[PDB]
Every structure is written in C-alpha cells, then in structure tokens.
Design a protein around this ligand. Structure first.
Ligand SMILES: Nc1nc2c(ncn2[C@@H]2O[C@H](COP(=O)(O)OP(=O)(O)O)[C@@H](O)[C@H]2O)c(=O)[nH]1
Ligand SMILES: Nc1nc2c(ncn2[C@@H]2O[C@H](COP(=O)(O)OP(=O)(O)O)[C@@H](O)[C@H]2O)c(=O)[nH]1
Ligand SMILES: [Mg+2]
Ligand SMILES: [Mg+2]
Lengths: 254, 251
C-alpha cells in the first residue's frame, strides 16, 4: 500500500470539492443543506479515501478546512490550520521520542492545495497572509481556481502577477517546463459531455465546453500527474526532512 | 435641462465592476498593509445630440477586500446619510433657490459567482443599507456559471434575501430571473459572421448582449432608459423622507 495526507484550503465556492472529486474520481462531498448566518470559523474535517486498484491501493487522507476566508472578519483564520499541522509534528516528535517506539503513526500534512480566486488582478491580502505564515510548515501548491473564468491573456497576466507577489513577499511554495506556467490554473468537473465524437469531462456553457483534461484549457492534467505515487514521495520527503525537522529543531533547542 | 443621476458601485475587487460600467456606455471609461474602504466619485457626461446625461459614479474601493472586513459598510452608510443630511439642511434654509442634490439614487451590489448562496458580508451589507438606498444585486462574471448552476444560484440568493427580509429595489416583467447575472466586455469578436461584444475563450465566446448568455441587456435597458426617474423618486420619497422624519423627530 501507500499513504498520503492532502490538505485543502480556500474560500467557499472556489471549486475545491469538485477538483478533489476530479483528481481521484470520487463523489466525496454532500450538498449544502439548510438556516442562515451563524458566524463562521475554520473547522478541520478529515476524510479517508481508500482507492483499491487490485493491490496497488492508496490510502488518502483529505484534510478540509471549511470556513477559511468566509467570515466578515477573517483575522487569524490561518491559526487553526497552523494548529492542526503543528500538532501532527508534535505527535510525531513525541512518538519517535518514546523508549518503545514500534508503532509510529504518521499523520503529518504532506501537501496543501491553496485555491486562489480568479479575480484577474493579483493575490488578495488573505492569500499573502496564509502562504507567508504556512510556507515553512507545509508544502503549499497554490492553484488558480475556476480557471475557465479567465481568457488566456487574462490568465497569463494573472499567473505572472501572482508569481511576482510570491517573490516580493519571499514566499516559498513547493517546487518540483512546469515551473514556466505557475501557479497551476485548474478546472474541475465530473460531468461527461460529448464534444465532437469524444466523451470528455468538462463544463457545458451555451457557447462551448471547458474541458478538464485539455491542456490548452487548464492545467488539471499537470496537477493530477504531479499527485501520483512517485511525486507524492518527494512531497512526503520534504515534509519529513525539512518541515518536520525544522519544527523539531526549534522545539528541542528551547 | 439635461439629466443627472448618482450611481454607487459596491463589491469585492476583481468582480468586473469597472468593466461592467464601461460596457453600459459602450466605451472604456476606466482601467502586507491594511486597506480601508474609501468612498470616491467621478463624473461621466454623455452628450448626444442636444441632451446631456451627467452621471456621478460613487465607488467604494477596498470593500470586502481585507482580511478583516468588520464594519466595512459604515463608510458607505456615512456617505449616503451625509447626502441626506446635506439635502435636509439645504431645503431648510430660508432661501433655498440653488439646490444641490447629491443623494445616492442607486447602488449596484456585485455578488461573487460562487454557485452556493450569499456570503455573510453580502447579507450584512444589504440588510444594513436596503432602507438607505436602492440596492440592485448583481451576480458578477456570470459566464462563471452554467445555466443550471446560475438558476440554482439565483434561487438560493433570493431565498436568503427573503429569509433576512432584505428589500432590494422594486423594478416597475422579468422579476422571476433575479438577481440579474451580468457579463461585461467591450471587446469585439466576430462570431458566426456577426460582430458582437464578448469574452473570447478557446471553447467559445460569451456574448455580453446575448440574452441567453447573460442579463446585461436587461440591466442596460433598466438603468440607461429613464427608469432612472423611478429610482430617483424612490430615493427622495422613501429613503430621504424616512431619514428626514427620523432626524426631525429627535428634536
Ligand atoms: N467556473 C467554474 N465553476 C466550477 C468549477 N468547479 C466547480 N465549479 C462550480 O462551483 C460551484 C461550487 O463548487 P464546489 O466544488 O462545491 O466548491 P467548494 O465550495 O470550494 O468546495 C459548483 O456550482 C460547481 O459546479 C470550475 O473549475 N470552474
Ligand atoms: N469571467 C469574466 N471576467 C470578467 C468580466 N468582466 C471583467 N472580467 C475580467 O475580470 C478582471 C477584473 O475586472 P475589473 O473590471 O477590473 O473588476 P473590478 O476590480 O471589480 O473593477 C479583468 O481581467 C476583466 O477582464 C465578466 O463578466 N466575466
Ligand atoms: Mg466543498
Ligand atoms: Mg475596478
């Protein structure tokens, strides 16, 4: 087998559930059921996705954070995400410090997808604060959400502006060309529609169909391929040898 | 004689607000530190033939854009109520001949096309301003939504407006398709022989003036055509008078 812990962060309604379902071919999320307005906070939610393909089975933990960025006042909304991540480091540090450390559960967060709203301008203040405060605790993959809302020229200018701001703020996102088109701009959909004679997943508008697996429409295929067993391993290795060790060295030095 | 009108625009940055205003006049008229809502205004004078339309556009840059948006409605309230206060003081003078009218007569509130419902900040703003100004809610960047999603999202929004007893502007016919879902662009693309304004994607063009694609043409006909007067009348006869009564009763 093989295990992996993926965290999802972003405002409500940025296509996060649809993208997760699109990457892993799941139907993991329930509809919004009724009944209005009670102040929102970031709540950590875990799903276990056990995907069996005949022996090569993947055990995937999806850590969602509904409420992030959704209140009128989003002050310190990163803090519950820090608390969850750092608590997993602490659990690991305590487990490996035991005299009899045979068992060893590993729940450290190995990747964080951060969804950027496709405004077409730049990063929001909350985007900068979240990434600047988490980039040394977890592997951040920033994503331009709902990328079918950008024309190609708008998308290109928006990618460039975002990368300009990540550099200006000395933000260290996860690094593996693919770097030429960061951040990845994704479209998600499990809806099948026939475009020409081929059935493909994508989003049906009156004027045409944005295709999830068309590399000229979005970077979904790049992202899915980046999240397979071999590239998951490097995400695990950096979590362990960089983020965990940095946390461990900091706590022990005190 | 001409004609004057004061239009306020409110919403998060990057919702196509400047673009939509440009589209309404077929011309491109626009476009780690904490930022506050500033209220700003500029004038747009349209002179066609012998008649002038003098439009004041009141913008609110910074609205809904910060990490902490607490009380970001207050600078909008302060501005609107101060125009009521100016009008009250001007018509109370013994000599009231010259009579400025800067009261805000319409407020376009742009809703991000999430596909779910209203955000808490949307409820707060509308609930706190709906008796001070004519609010027209607008689904921004409506090419973000499939038709099914758009219909679902409109119905969800209207349920919540009713739930929070919000009173949006009563248009005096296409009342079942609220809120209006708009698309903005002055870019010209040739589609199937006819040249139209729209947004070019690799898979097709969303057309600003095509009514099966969005509700821009409905918004344009309401605002541009002199349904402006009805918005004026409601501003003076209801919003202003409600203000005025409240101020005077406390004397
Ligand atoms: N334009 C666009 N809409 C999307 C995309 N993915 C999902 N949606 C729609 O966005 C709405 C919210 O999607 P959801 O997955 O629940 O987003 P979440 O709240 O962040 O989990 C739904 O109506 C989806 O059909 C996308 O890639 N582009
Ligand atoms: N998808 C979509 N994008 C739009 C629309 N109108 C404008 N945009 C794009 O959204 C980005 C921001 O538009 P802008 O008018 O500056 O929004 P503002 O900040 O609210 O004024 C620009 O790249 C526009 O081209 C629309 O109706 N749909
Ligand atoms: Mg979801
Ligand atoms: Mg603007």
């Amino acid at each position: 087998g093989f295990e992996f812990t993926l965290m999802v962060v972003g405002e409500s309604g940025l296509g996060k559930s649809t993208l997760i379902n699109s990457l892993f071919l799941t139907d993991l999320y329930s509809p919004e059921y009724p009944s209005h307005r009670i102040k929102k906070t970031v709540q950590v939610e875990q799903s276990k996705v056990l995907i069996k393909e005949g022996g090569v089975q993947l055990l995937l933990t999806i850590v969602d954070t509904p409420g992030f960025g959704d209140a009128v006042d989003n002050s310190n909304c990163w803090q519950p995400v820090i608390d969850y991540i750092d608590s997993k480091f602490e659990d690991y540090l305590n487990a490996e410090s035991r005299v009899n450390r045979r068992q060893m559960p590993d729940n450290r967060v190995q990747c964080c997808l951060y969804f950027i709203a496709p405004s077409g301008h730049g990063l929001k203040p909350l985007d900068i604060e979240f990434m600047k405060r988490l980039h040394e605790k977890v592997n951040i993959i920033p994503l331009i959400a709902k990328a079918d809302t950008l024309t190609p020229e708008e998308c290109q200018q928006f990618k460039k502006q975002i990368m300009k701001e990540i550099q200006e703020h000395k933000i260290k996102i996860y690094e593996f060309k693919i770097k030429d088109r960061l951040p990845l701009a994704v479209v998600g959909s499990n809806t099948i529609i026939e475009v020409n004679g081929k059935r493909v997943r994508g989003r049906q508008y009156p004027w045409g169909v944005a295709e999830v697996e068309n590399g000229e429409h979005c970077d979904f295929t790049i992202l899915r391929n980046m999240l397979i067993r071999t590239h998951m391993q490097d995400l695990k290795d950096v979590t362990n040898n960089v983020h965990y060790e940095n946390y461990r060295s900091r706590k022990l030095a005190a």
